Symmetry: D2
Subunit: 102 residues, 4 copies
């Protein structure tokens, strides 16, 4: 009984959004998106995570992320929708842009 509408698997809109973040992979049932970000070291990884943290608390939409030294393993979905919303793709896009710097 998720209070929010999720983007339906393979919906034209979902796919139009995915196209903007092509290095993320859609998960089974299209219920989330995943990307493992790789940096040279922890210092770079934290620099990246820092910008995402600011964005996340500003839009109040947070990554499920697993950091191990130079690696940041990320899965995005909207809990209140039990799946993907526009906020996940907007978060993925910001993350992609912040990582592009490295």
């Amino acid at each position: 009984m998720a209070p929010l509408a999720r983007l339906a698997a393979n919906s034209a809109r979902l796919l139009q959004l995915h196209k903007t973040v092509p290095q993320w992979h859609l998960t089974d049932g299209h219920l989330s998106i995943k990307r493992k970000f790789q940096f040279s070291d922890f210092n770079e990884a934290w620099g990246f995570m820092s910008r995402v943290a600011l964005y996340a608390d500003k839009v109040d939409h947070h990554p499920n992320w697993y950091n191990v030294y130079n690696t940041v393993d990320v899965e995005l979905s909207t809990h209140d929708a039990a799946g993907l919303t526009e906020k996940d793709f907007a978060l993925a896009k910001f993350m992609d842009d912040a990582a592009k710097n490295f």
Copy 2:
């Protein structure tokens, strides 16, 4: 130097960080930290990040909003070292503030 499962030093170190859970084979220690919100969790993580890069010893941590799910082990040792307990302790102290 790798700490053997149930070794005297491991058990002694573990007493300094009693909220941590020894894992199968004593290959790692785990603690899940919980805060009021992400802002608090990030303030916590920020202090740990600084410590981690200073001593060059890094957590395996999974953050979701207000929680930080942490597993510590020495990657080059295939088990626990002193550095893991030292990090666990720094993390405990940083968490106390909240």
Copy 3:
């Protein structure tokens, strides 16, 4: 809306953040925070950074190791607004943890 020097609202807000010092013309409020070390100061600043970008209201802060010398004012207002006192309060609360 810009708070006029010595206005009733300014003085009332100032009571919620008594460690802050009103500046000449009541154009800003200042507080210098002190911590044990940089690690603590950075943990403090990190929480404030998150708050600041959330509400889109930023401190004028000068950090040297363990100290954070802070002046707050609303750049578009040429003086103090509610947002400055709200930020001052968030900063006070973040500092309390240390």
Copy 4:
């Protein structure tokens, strides 16, 4: 009575180090170096400061920095030397590299 030796003003070594960080400016008496870093927004500035913070606590050598939204105004010197040392230029260089990303 500074416990540490500072690099003498105009010393060949000072100048050889300054050459590596050409956008920093030497201060009167060559007692410090200064650079005002400019970013697009606070989010970028904090991303930058974050990496420098990690470096600073690792080498235990900290900037005197004044952040105002998208701007980071920095002055580096070694207090225990009452002037510049190699650590200031190594810090400036790291800062330059972290900022280059933006």
